[PDB]
């Protein structure tokens, strides 16, 4: 037993990370088949980022200006193009380590693993969630751009995130692998502020089910509630509204534990209104919202890849 | 910026995980060069675990009784021996993916990454600490035995843990890669209880430095203290005593931030005596103690492998 914030094994993605340098700027790229994907602001200087015209900046870049290095070995760039906010660098060699993969655009509230990299080299792996304001709370230093987020289903890597930007408030913004930012953010160094960071209610409920499964159950009470009543409290506490779709997704955890979803909502309601009173749940003193119901089922059953 | 509970990239260890089956019991083994390491209780039935005599049980096992499978391919076992609480299975093929590696026995308070596996297949990666009572708090289901914990220094994997047991209280116990349990635990299904789970004071202080570096500093105050005074409070709150050795290890974080170590101790003292008052530090409502000073420096600087 036990329940931990767990990332996917990163080996399959490690084999895809390369370094990309354009002029004075170095960041990471993702090498799949014979294409390397990276943030288009690899072509920008620090000065350019204040007001970049990417189409004009790109005119001055040729294939040989994109230095792509896989480990100690250089890759030959035979073509390049811009798609939304990513560059696709065509190389003359297909990555021999390419896994089965897909590109996916995830919804707010979904979780994924991040492989933080610098200079094409992996530094660490950790679990994130796409927040309801379309930021993520990661660990990204200068040079981490082009690090990616992903999920694995058996043997297929679904890439869903590429890192592009840190907002002045310390949260992070990026794109899917087609180059489209999550949320309203842009790859300009300007005043863009995140909206309310609402809590992912369905994920909190999943995690309470995980706690019950793993022994922590002091928060279970004698009450129930309704969706509408619960959501009156959810709004007050900046929780996402809970929908019938969410209730349906929690069904399997409800069945495993015998605790009806609305009963667990009543437990969550009391936790919101009364606090933890100095107690903990699965080693946490706040309500964790970066485990999905699918995450809980997966970890509690031992799915492998 | 940002600070996350980060594990090492797991690729190098993924390439070493195999399945080991003896009779009706299947768990994981670690394949390095031409040796597979696994828990000796792979030879036990559930009944045997109540009072096993491993030397006697092993007499009935031959090389061909240890079924070792690497992916879809079977390995040939040409010898076996027991060393403390692990078996070493000699196979006729050296693992072609063997990384540079070392075996290390870690001290309480040191952290490491765990690659949770089932049937030789990786499930997920997460960060742990060797607790002061020589347990770890992991995520281990039936079949996870033989999963390992490790650190990476550039290109060399230092293996420090192999999973063997879950105590009735839900915490976990295991060995180094020479087969010696951490702490007083044994591979018998009996009444063994963990001692006090004291908090790793030096790690909490490291994490407060990480918070300051990453913007969270409301807990900084106008006070200082001394080692002896601080430790009077540490004892009351079941914190490890802070030593001059610990102060020395925190020196580099002290220098980066300009906050003297004893000043940070005074901040921690007030946090212990007054609580968080409903505030958070790096997204946590309790004081995190599973980041080492070396972890903080590493993550805040972007070390790669
Ligand atoms: Cl533009
Ligand atoms: Cl917490
Ligand atoms: Cl024995």
UniProtKB/Swiss-Prot annotation, chains A, B:
Q: Which residues of the full protein are shown?
A: 3264 to 3568 of 7096
Name of the molecule in the record: 3C-like proteinase nsp5
Activity control mechanisms: Inhibited by pyridone-containing alpha-ketoamides compounds 13a and 13b. In turn, alpha-ketoamide 13b (tert-butyl (1-((S)-1-(((S)-4-(benzylamino)-3,4-dioxo-1-((S)-2-oxopyrrolidin-3-yl)butan-2-yl)amino)-3-cyclopropyl-1-oxopropan-2-yl)-2-oxo-1,2-dihydropyridin-3-yl)carbamate) inhibits SARS-CoV-2 replication in human lung cells. Inhibited ex vivo by michael acceptor inhibitor N3. Inhibited ex vivo by compound 11a and 11b.
Q: Subunit details for this protein?
A: 3CL-PRO exists as monomer and homodimer. Only the homodimer shows catalytic activity. Interacts with host FBXO22; this interaction promotes the proteasomal degradation of nsp5.
Effect of substituting residue 205 to V: In strain: Zeta/P.2
Query: Could you tell me which residue ranges are on the Cytoplasmic side of the membrane?
Result: 1-305
Subcellular location(s): the record lists: Host cytoplasm; Host Golgi apparatus; Host nucleus
Q: Which residues form the active site?
A: 41 (for 3cl-pro activity), 145 (nucleophile)
Q: Which domain of life is it from?
A: Viruses
């Amino acid at each position: 037993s036990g329940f931990r914030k767990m990332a996917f094994p990163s080996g399959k993605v490690e084999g895809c990370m390369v370094q990309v340098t354009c002029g004075t700027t170095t960041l990471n790229g993702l090498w799949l088949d014979d294409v390397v994907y990276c943030p288009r602001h690899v072509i920008c200087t620090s000065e350019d980022m204040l007001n970049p015209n990417y189409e004009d900046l790109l005119i001055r870049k040729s294939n040989h200006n994109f230095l792509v290095q896989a480990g100690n070995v250089q890759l030959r760039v035979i073509g390049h193009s811009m798609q939304n906010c990513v560059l696709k660098l065509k190389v003359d060699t297909a990555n021999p380590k390419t896994p089965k993969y897909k590109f996916v655009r995830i919804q707010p509230g979904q979780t994924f693993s991040v492989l933080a990299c610098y200079n094409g080299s992996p530094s660490g792996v950790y679990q994130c969630a796409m927040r309801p304001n379309f930021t993520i709370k990661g660990s990204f230093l200068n040079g981490s751009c082009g690090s990616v987020g992903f999920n694995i289903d058996y043997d297929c890597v679904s890439f869903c995130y590429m890192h592009h930007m840190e907002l002045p408030t310390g949260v992070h913004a990026g794109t899917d692998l087609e180059g489209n930012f999550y949320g309203p953010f842009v790859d300009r160094q300007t005043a863009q502020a995140a909206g309310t960071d609402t809590t992912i209610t369905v994920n909190v409920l999943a995690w309470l089910y995980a706690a019950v499964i793993n022994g922590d159950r002091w928060f279970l009470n004698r009450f129930t509630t309704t969706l509408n009543d619960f959501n009156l409290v959810a709004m007050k506490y900046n929780y996402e509204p809970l929908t019938q779709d969410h209730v349906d997704i929690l069904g399997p955890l409800s069945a495993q534990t015998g605790i009806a979803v609305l009963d667990m909502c009543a437990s969550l309601k009391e936790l919101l209104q009364n606090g933890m009173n100095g107690r903990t749940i699965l080693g946490s003193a706040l309500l964790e919202d970066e485990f999905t119901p699918f995450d809980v089922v997966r970890q509690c059953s031992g799915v492998t890849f």
